[PDB]
Design a protein around this ligand. Structure first.
Ligand SMILES: CCCCCCCCCCCCCCCCCC(=O)OC[C@H](COP(=O)([O-])OCC(O)COP(=O)([O-])OC[C@@H](COC(=O)CCCCCCCCCCCCCCCCC)OC(=O)CCCCCCCCCCCCCCCCC)OC(=O)CCCCCCCCCCCCCCCCC
Ligand SMILES: CCCCCCCCCCCCCCCCCC(=O)OC[C@H](COP(=O)([O-])OCC(O)COP(=O)([O-])OC[C@@H](COC(=O)CCCCCCCCCCCCCCCCC)OC(=O)CCCCCCCCCCCCCCCCC)OC(=O)CCCCCCCCCCCCCCCCC
Ligand SMILES: CCCCCCCCCCCCCCCCCC(=O)OC[C@H](COP(=O)([O-])OCC(O)COP(=O)([O-])OC[C@@H](COC(=O)CCCCCCCCCCCCCCCCC)OC(=O)CCCCCCCCCCCCCCCCC)OC(=O)CCCCCCCCCCCCCCCCC
Ligand SMILES: CCCCCCCCCCCCCCCCCC(=O)OC[C@H](COP(=O)(O)OCCN)OC(=O)CCCCCCCCCCCCCCCCC
Ligand SMILES: CCCCCCCCCCCCCCCCCC(=O)OC[C@H](COP(=O)(O)OCCN)OC(=O)CCCCCCCCCCCCCCCCC
Ligand SMILES: CCCCCCCCCCCCCCCCCC(=O)OC[C@H](COP(=O)(O)OCCN)OC(=O)CCCCCCCCCCCCCCCCC
Ligand SMILES: CCCCCCCCCCCCCCCCCC(=O)OC[C@H](COP(=O)(O)OCCN)OC(=O)CCCCCCCCCCCCCCCCC
Ligand SMILES: CCCCCCCCCCCCCCCCCC(=O)OC[C@H](COP(=O)(O)OCCN)OC(=O)CCCCCCCCCCCCCCCCC
Ligand SMILES: CCCCCCCCCCCCCCCCCC(=O)OC[C@H](COP(=O)(O)OCCN)OC(=O)CCCCCCCCCCCCCCCCC
Ligand SMILES: Nc1ncnc2c1ncn2[C@@H]1O[C@H](COP(=O)(O)O)[C@@H](O)[C@H]1O
Lengths: 347, 80, 140, 98, 320, 63, 49, 167, 120
């Protein structure tokens, strides 16, 4: 791809999400989602192989279906309210359709079935964009419509995403599917706290984006898309194994790390609202996520897998890859828990 | 700036005419003295009913009848 | 299916055994139909007859679990004269687990489902007693 | 509410169930998707014309334009799929199960 | 880096420097074809940069002080022990072939980087397109296993697909008897242990597999032993070629920009040479891997990135 | 440390932590009341700005 | 010399070192100026002078 | 019968959607969506949307479904379809029978069964079409809408040229 | 929760009333911890590029420390502002709703009967 065309297309992805974040009219929300999907299709077809075309076709079909359901929810809102303000919806059917549409755009279970396929089909940088930047616009729409979101629907989606994303990553050896099921479980955690305190939704979103960007940046820096190619990293770059160790222990939510910060605050907001069974079962279900994170830490940092002879050639060459913000992201994804009360800046 | 223009006029006169007509479309309404009259004629066209005002007692510029002297006039449009 | 749970929980324990058994059977049948729907959705059966056989098998399995659960719970509430007691639903959940083991034709699945479904039904009874909320309304 | 809205919503749900139950062709899925768009156009238009809501009269055009651009993108994806397998069958798009 | 997307945006196009003499020419032949001077002769008539044939220590010549590293750090394999014991137990044969394929991949990346950054053509000797004719010649002699051929074909399948073929492929017809005569006149006591059937398999995979498949994607020139002695006839044949085959014709600034971005990142070039296929000839276990890695780091100029080694006299490190 | 110092330092610790606990309980009760009634500065979800309304005479009178 | 190829980081990028030190010194003087202006505004609004 | 003309056109509209959504072949599906677009244009025209209905003809049918049938003719060259078609037809005419015998129905929303002429306005708009004036205000009031739509169409050109190239 | 509070004046990182508050000291231990995180980022930046970790690029390590301290100072200002807003709203709501917050009669333990449970 032409680098100028790449810059214009990435600015258009950003512009679509920004239009979603700044607009007061529902048509401009829908336009921001259309602009974002249209611009992100070439980022997925960047390398021109049949797996990327299949991933882009599956992504197109799910996001287009969600976009039509979103427009039907907008149109039903216009029936029962005569207006277009991005605020609470004025019909429970429109609220259900918009919550379904946003759950499809997020890839929350049981609309999760595209996220491991599309994440596996595309390069690591475009899957980084898919799992971090593409969550931002539907979460902002969920933020603004929460006075009309049905509680049982959003909590069903939340627990179903956490359980399905926990069990889905246990069977995986591909790193992109591991990050995709990890994404599904973390979005379940974000929507579970949404009607109680959406500031903790924003906190979980930001910490998830930092940790996921860290893991994708490590995978890009080591050119690893499988568990077994990530297991060669100790014989090539031993600092990278320490970084994937601390970041995966943080994504499991183990204190004293920063990824313990969201779920703890989420439990802290769900028990104030007298929900005790639900954050309990959510936290116990997240042990599945920690189990396959620990599987990756065993294969990468805590043991030394056998290498190959040709690795000795790669000892003679330094990493020329721009590992953009990787030390900053690695520090923020691990050492941020003593600054947990900084979350009030999200209020 | 002069050999280039003659070169592109010899090779591609369709594109030279296209960019010339488009440039005259862009810059000439800012240079026309009659662009103001377009706005004046559009705002002088009465699509709606001129809903009258309650005479509170002190409105010297608002007429009491259409044939009164005060009020907006269209002599500029009859004359031009 | 929220009204199915309401017509289950409206009747007091150990009073009307046949209608409690029928209500729990209907709850189990609805859960079996949901499982059958996603089962023939995500996994295509080889024929229409195989699909309706899987649907009838899962629906009758979950309905028999619900029937033997509600029957055993109401009979244990009658013979002990303790309606507000989670040991009744512990026995009922173990009976439903033995039913799930009998449908899968295995003893180990039966004992595991006895233990876990009995503890789950005991927790559901305790949550009905003390008012435990799973989908709690936002209050603060 | 008024009687035509029942049929335009039912048309949307019919094209929704057509788009949610594939047979074989990706083109038939794209046709059901654009039928969903057409019904959204008609429903938006009937509301906006009934309400005499003047500025929203430009809304369905925008709804048309974006979605037809979306349709163009879909056709291009189909063509690239059809440049791989010879057909646009959805059962050829299963490499990402593993 | 020095070249990137920004330099491509700010005007650096490689078709500005892609002249008519910017030709990647690979000279091929059997073990004593005498091509090694012919290549150099072509590179001193057409004004091209000559790369000598990538051996075990090519990467050593491109990195560090340029001097060859000890064999446990580069290669872990011996050509002379392949000549002595070809069917050896330790797996020297395929380990040598896999290291040589990685070395030729690095050399082809260096050649394309020089061609795309300077516009000067490069003369190579036995590129990655002709490396496999040793592999099959080993497999037909029972020197390596079928699993070694499968590993080689996986690594070649995901590495050679990223590059462009040469413009000109020069082949030197030398029969097996003349190869053996030049081996016996060479005097190398290991190289005189090469059998006739191995040289005949090299010639068979040359003439039956390599040259037919390179006749479509580029222009094969084929000379005997005596008509390759005249360099002027070879350069006259090269200068009067009508280039009409292969994917060099449809290379704009964008595709060649992407190729130059590939061939300057040497770890990305060498990415799939170490794929996790646990083949016993190339698998190094963790204790030997750890020990040889830590011994490699203690070499001079090898502990840090190249501008950051006080032991070899790097200054201003606290401002770098 | 002297026992006097530890004693009075303990009293300062207990006063600070009891005041923080009472403020947390009041914060929970305030959040409950403001979510229930909507009359406080918190849980103020947006409605339509009335400054968007055109108050001019329209084309027809009955509006 | 030691290396067969001149490394990219054999000599320090003096433009980038100058931009680094200048940006860091600018951020420190802006931070101290902001902090002094903030304590002065706090003392002015709360009457502690 | 003539007071129900928008309702009759909406019945034909749903019948056309059951036609193509049962998916016989993408060419007959294209034909069904064409007939549906024509009758939906007729519905829009009968609520007074002349320009929006002509946009359905010019842009949806004459622009987009032409490209659909074109791509389908370049790519292409039952019992489930017929059963699905009669299923949707019987569901639609049961809806018709219920809302005509009761003058009220409730599938998900409550629907009146009177002729949909009843909801209209009883005045005039003077010397303009209100729908034409609201569409004309895209250039005066819809500046940001023009910007985001034109930028999305330019990006759409660029995106189609990227993904169809294969390089 | 407090999103209608900061909606009349949107997108202000620090509003004008935040200047009524004392700013964080430059010797704030939170700010020293953020500077420590900048130093750790500088060390990881030397480590992943195989530079000597403590010695190489002291200008870069110092810009890491400086940039984290710079961003973190304003983040701590906004943090302290938002908790001050939280308490201001709490106290104004308690003061305006006395019927919801009555003064509870505190009883001494001579009147308070607690049940005794023997550990035996
Ligand atoms: C507010 C949020 C800010 C978020 C981060 C924004 C910047 C990063 C994102 C874009 C990016 O990658 O830019 C390059 C990026 C470096 O990223 P990189 O490539 O990963 O770094 C590797 C080496 O630093 C590269 O080394 P090099 O040899 O190529 O050059 C040395 C380089 C040379 O530097 C320069 O050239 C700078 C001078 C020119 C600047 C522009 C002038 C016009 O030095 C540095 O850049 C030192 C590192 C600076 C710190 C990086 C992280 C910034 C702080 C992020 C926020 C931390 C908050 C923690 C809160 C914790 C509690 C919640 O930034 C810079 O080059 C300049 C940083 C300036 C920071 C200013 C902070 C205050 C702003 C107000
Ligand atoms: C759930 C209750 C269990 C039902 C599922 C059993 C496993 C799946 C199955 O049927 O596999 C057969 C079948 C094929 O598997 P398979 O080839 O037989 O694999 C087993 C091997 O044959 C291996 O041979 P096997 O069949 O002889 O051994 C199987 C073994 C049976 O174990 C034995 O044979 C030996 C052990 C005796 C039984 C286990 C005793 C455990 C006691 C509790 C732990 C100690 C607590 C102490 C507390 C003291 C104070 C009270 O059972 C298990 O491994 C399952 C254990 C329980 C599963 C749930 C665990 C969730 C833990 C969550 C945190 C707590 O699976 C399927 O086709 C999948 C679908 C099966 C039907 C649907 C599942 C029933 C759902 C009913 C509703 C449940 C609602 C949730 C309630 C609980 C959560 C809130
Ligand atoms: C500080 C902490 C962060 C350090 C990051 C960089 C570490 C590093 O590279 O050290 C190497 C360097 C020595 O290495 P070298 O010889 O120069 O070159 C590298 C070698 O060749 C290395 O040889 P190699 O790479 O060829 O092979 C050996 C291999 C060995 O590795 C293996 O074989 C694989 C791994 C073995 C098993 C895993 C062990 C556990 C590692 C992870 C830690 C987990 C626990 C952390 C907390 C629990 C939660 C996860 O890899 C390494 O040793 C690589 C170096 C990294 C070692 C240390 C890693 C620390 C980074 C991660 C932890 C800290 C950040 C996250 C914290 C999380 C929450 C607290 O160590 C130091 O210089 C340590 C620092 C000593 C001076 C400290 C002075 C402090 C002054 C503070 C005041 C000034 C600032 C004021 C600020 C405020 C202003 C207002
Ligand atoms: C209320 C919240 C409002 C919103 C707040 C902000 C949200 C930020 C969301 C971050 C999402 C970042 C997605 C990545 C950047 C987008 C463009 C992109 O992917 O560029 C990467 C680029 C591509 O390289 P390429 O050549 O394509 O790779 C193929 C192999 N040669 O180059 C590379 O691949 C180089 C490898 C390193 C790239 C690392 C990029 C890290 C960016 C994320 C930083 C962390 C998130 C920001 C901080 C927290 C914010 C919540
Ligand atoms: C600012 C005003 C508004 C401008 C935008 C609106 C334009 C309206 C007309 C629509 C034009 C859209 C399409 C334009 C395509 C331009 C690119 C192009 O055609 O480049 C190729 C062409 C050489 O043609 P070739 O590729 O060989 O095609 C086969 C025929 N030989 O290359 C050429 O022939 C060179 C063409 C560029 C130079 C033409 C210069 C004309 C100057 C006229 C006088 C100045 C007018 C004022 C505006 C400034 C123009 C630079
Ligand atoms: C109780 C009756 C349930 C009847 C519907 C399910 C029966 C079934 O699985 O039918 C098989 C059908 C696939 O059709 P099949 O004939 O297998 O395709 C090969 C081409 N001759 O499978 C399908 O069509 C899959 C979708 C069927 C509907 C699923 C939801 C309703 C049925 C389950 C819940 C009740
Ligand atoms: C390990 C798993 C542990 C699970 C513990 C669950 C604890 C019970 C929570 C739900 C429950 O039973 O709540 C009691 C409630 C009846 O009480 P009440 O609030 O008065 O409801 C009447 C509504 N007007 O009842 C209800 O709200 C409705 C009945 C809920 C029953 C939940 C289980 C149904 C069967 C499985 C699905
Ligand atoms: C419950 C929600 C849906 C309710 C309406 C059901 C309509 C009748 C269809 C039932 C399923 C029949 C069937 O065979 O479905 C599968 C078929 C696609 O499968 P195919 O490969 O064509 O055939 C092999 C068999 N699986 O699937 C299709 O072709 C289905 C096309 C559906 C189009 C909707 C038409 C209107 C339906 C009524 C209004 C809603
Ligand atoms: C990194 C820090 C970069 C800060 C740059 C300035 C940003 C700014 O002024 O943001 C204003 C915003 C408060 O604006 P407000 O309208 O209250 O936002 C409601 C959103 N739910 O302020 C904020 O949202 C500040 C907190 C953002 C923190 C994001 C990274 C952690
Ligand atoms: N499998 C192999 N067997 C023998 N020689 C090889 C093999 N692979 C590469 N070579 C190289 O080919 C050279 C023979 O050609 P020449 O350079 O003309 O002597 C040897 O000296 C090796 O460097």
């Amino acid at each position: 791809m032409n680098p100028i065309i790449l810059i214009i297309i990435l600015m258009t992805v950003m512009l679509g999400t920004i239009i979603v974040m700044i607009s007061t009219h529902w048509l401009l929300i829908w336009i921001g989602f259309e602009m974002n999907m249209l611009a992100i299709i070439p980022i997925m077809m960047k390398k021109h192989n049949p797996r990327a075309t299949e991933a882009s076709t599956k992504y197109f079909l799910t996001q287009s279906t969600a976009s039509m359901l979103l427009m039907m929810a907008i149109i039903i809102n216009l029936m029962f309210s005569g207006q277009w303000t991005v605020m609470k919806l004025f019909n429970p059917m429109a609220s259900m359709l918009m919550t379904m549409a946003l759950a499809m755009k997020l890839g929350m279970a049981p609309f999760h079935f595209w996220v491991p396929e599309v994440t596996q089909g595309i390069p690591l940088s475009s899957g980084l964009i898919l799992l971090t930047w593409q969550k931002l616009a539907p979460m902002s729409v969920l933020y603004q419509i929460l006075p009309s979101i049905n509680l049982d629907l959003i909590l069903t989606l939340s627990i179903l995403s956490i359980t399905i994303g926990g069990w889905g990553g246990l069977n995986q050896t591909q790193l992109r599917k591991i990050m995709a099921y990890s994404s599904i479980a973390h979005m379940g955690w974000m929507t579970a706290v949404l009607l109680y305190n959406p500031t903790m939704t924003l906190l979980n979103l930001i910490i998830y984006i930092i940790m996921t960007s860290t893991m994708f940046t490590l995978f890009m820096a080591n050119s690893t898309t499988t568990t077994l190619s990530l297991s060669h990293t100790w014989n090539k770059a031993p600092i990278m194994t320490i970084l994937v160790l601390i970041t995966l222990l943080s994504m499991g939510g183990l204190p004293p790390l920063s990824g313990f910060m969201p779920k703890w605050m989420i439990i802290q907001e769900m028990t104030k609202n007298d929900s005790i069974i639900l954050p309990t079962l959510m936290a116990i279900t997240a042990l599945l996520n920690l189990y396959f994170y620990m599987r990756l830490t065993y294969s990468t940092a805590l043991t030394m897998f056998p290498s190959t002879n040709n690795m000795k050639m790669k000892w003679q060459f330094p990493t020329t890859k721009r590992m953009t913000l990787l030390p900053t992201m690695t520090v923020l994804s691990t050492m941020l828990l003593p600054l947990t009360p900084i979350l009030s800046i999200l209020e | 700036v002069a050999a280039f223009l003659k070169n592109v006029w010899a090779k591609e006169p369709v594109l030279v005419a296209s960019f010339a007509i488009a440039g005259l479309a862009v810059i000439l309404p800012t240079l026309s003295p009659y662009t103001k009259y377009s706005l004046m004629i559009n705002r002088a066209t009465p699509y709606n009913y001129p809903v009258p005002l309650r005479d509170d007692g002190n409105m010297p510029d608002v007429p009491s009848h259409p044939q009164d002297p005060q009020g907006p006039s269209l002599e500029w449009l009859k004359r031009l | 299916a929220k009204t199915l749970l309401h017509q289950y929980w409206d009747i007091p324990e150990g009073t009307e055994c046949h209608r409690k058994t029928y209500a729990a059977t209907s709850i189990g049948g609805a859960s079996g139909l949901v499982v059958s729907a996603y089962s023939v959705a995500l996994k295509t059966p080889t024929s229409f007859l195989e699909g309706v056989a899987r649907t009838g098998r899962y629906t009758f399995t979950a309905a028999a679990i619900g029937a033997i659960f509600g029957l055993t719970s109401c009979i244990s509430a009658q013979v002990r004269e303790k309606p507000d007691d989670p040991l009744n639903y512990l026995i009922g959940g173990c009976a439903g687990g033995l039913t799930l083991g009998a449908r899968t034709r295995s003893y180990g699945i039966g004992a595991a489902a006895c233990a876990y479904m009995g503890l789950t039904a005991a927790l559901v009874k305790m949550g009905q007693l003390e008012g435990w909320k799973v989908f709690a309304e936002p209050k603060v | 509410m008024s009687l035509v809205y029942m049929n335009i919503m039912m048309a949307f749900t019919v094209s929704l169930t057509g788009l949610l139950m594939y047979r074989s062709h990706l083109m038939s899925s794209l046709l059901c998707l654009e039928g969903m768009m057409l019904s959204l156009f008609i429903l938006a238009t009937l509301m906006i014309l009934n309400s005499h809501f003047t500025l929203a009269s430009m809304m369905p055009i925008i709804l048309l334009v974006f979605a037809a651009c979306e349709a163009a993108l879909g056709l291009s994806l189909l063509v690239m799929v059809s440049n791989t397998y010879g057909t646009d069958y959805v059962q050829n798009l299963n490499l990402l199960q593993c | 880096l020095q070249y990137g997307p920004l330099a491509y945006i700010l005007g650096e196009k490689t078709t500005k420097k892609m002249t008519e003499n910017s030709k990647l020419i690979t000279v091929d032949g059997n073990i004593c074809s005498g091509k090694s001077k012919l290549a150099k002769e072509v590179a001193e008539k057409l004004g091209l940069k000559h790369f000598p044939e990538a051996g075990i220590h090519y990467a050593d010549s491109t990195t560090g002080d340029g001097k060859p590293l000890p064999v446990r750090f580069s290669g872990n394999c011996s050509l002379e022990k392949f000549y002595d014991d070809p069917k050896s137990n330790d797996g020297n044969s395929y380990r040598l072939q896999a290291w040589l394929y990685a070395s030729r991949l690095l050399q082809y990346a260096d050649a394309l980087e020089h061609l795309l950054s300077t516009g000067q053509g490069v003369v190579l000797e036995r590129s990655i397109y002709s490396d496999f004719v040793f592999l099959e010649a080993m497999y037909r002699q029972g020197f390596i296993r079928k699993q070694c051929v499968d590993h080689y074909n996986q690594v070649k399948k995901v590495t050679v697909c990223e590059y462009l073929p040469p413009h000109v492929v020069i082949y030197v017809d030398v029969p097996v008897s003349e190869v053996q005569s030049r081996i016996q006149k060479k005097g190398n006591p290991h190289e005189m242990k090469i059998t006739s059937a191995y040289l005949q398999d090299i010639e068979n995979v040359y003439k039956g597999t390599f040259l037919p498949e390179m006749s479509e994607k580029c222009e094969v020139l084929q000379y005997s032993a005596w008509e390759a002695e005249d360099a002027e006839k070879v350069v006259e044949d090269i200068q009067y070629l009508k280039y009409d085959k292969g994917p060099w014709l449809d290379q704009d600034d964008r595709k060649l920009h992407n190729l130059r971005m590939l061939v300057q990142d040497k770890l990305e070039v060498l990415n799939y040479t170490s794929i996790p296929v646990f083949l016993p000839e190339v698998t190094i276990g963790a204790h030997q891997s750890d020990r040889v890695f830590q011994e490699f780091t203690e070499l001079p100029g090898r502990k840090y990135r190249a501008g950051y080694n006080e032991d070899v006299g790097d200054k201003w490190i606290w401002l770098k | 440390d002297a026992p006097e110092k530890n004693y009075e330092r303990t009293m300062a610790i207990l006063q600070i932590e009891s005041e923080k606990a009472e403020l947390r309980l009041k914060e929970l009760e305030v959040r409950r009341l403001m979510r229930a009634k909507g009359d406080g500065p918190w849980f103020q979800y947006p409605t339509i700005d009335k400054a968007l309304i055109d108050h001019s005479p329209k084309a027809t009178p009955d509006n | 010399k030691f290396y067969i190829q001149e490394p990219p980081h054999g000599s320090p990028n003096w433009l980038k070192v100058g931009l680094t030190l200048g940006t860091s010194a600018f951020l420190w003087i802006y931070l101290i100026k902001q902090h002094n202006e903030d304590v002065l505004e706090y003392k002015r609004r709360n009457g502690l002078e | 019968m003539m007071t129900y003309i928008v309702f009759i056109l909406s019945i034909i509209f749903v019948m056309g959607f059951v036609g193509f959504s049962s998916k016989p072949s993408p060419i007959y599906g294209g034909l069904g969506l064409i007939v549906s677009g024509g009758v939906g244009c007729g519905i829009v025209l009968n609520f007074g949307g002349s320009f929006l209905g002509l946009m359905v003809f010019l842009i949806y049918l004459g622009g987009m479904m032409v490209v659909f049938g074109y791509t389908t003719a370049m790519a292409t060259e039952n019992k489930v379809v017929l059963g699905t078609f009669i299923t949707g037809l019987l569901m639609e005419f049961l809806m018709v029978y219920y809302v005509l015998k009761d003058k009220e129905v409730e599938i998900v929303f409550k629907f009146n069964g009177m002729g949909d002429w009843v909801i209209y306005d009883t005045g005039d708009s003077g010397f303009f079409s209100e729908e034409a004036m609201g569409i004309a205000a895209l250039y005066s009031y819809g500046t940001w809408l023009v910007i985001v739509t034109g930028w999305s169409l330019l990006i759409g050109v660029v995106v189609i040229m990227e993904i169809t190239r294969g390089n | 929760m407090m999103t209608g509070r900061q909606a009349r004046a949107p997108l202000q990182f620090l509003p004008d009333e935040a200047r009524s508050l004392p700013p964080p000291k430059l010797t704030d231990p939170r700010l020293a911890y953020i500077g420590f995180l900048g130093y750790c980022s500088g060390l990881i930046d030397n480590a992943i590029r195989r530079r000597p970790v403590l010695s190489a690029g002291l200008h870069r390590q110092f810009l890491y420390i400086t940039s984290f301290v710079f961003v973190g100072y304003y983040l701590l200002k906004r943090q302290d502002y938002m908790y001050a807003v939280r308490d201001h709203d709490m106290f104004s709501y308690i003061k305006s709703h006395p019927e919801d917050f009555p003064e509870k009669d505190k009883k001494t333990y001579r009147e308070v009967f607690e049940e005794f449970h023997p550990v035996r």
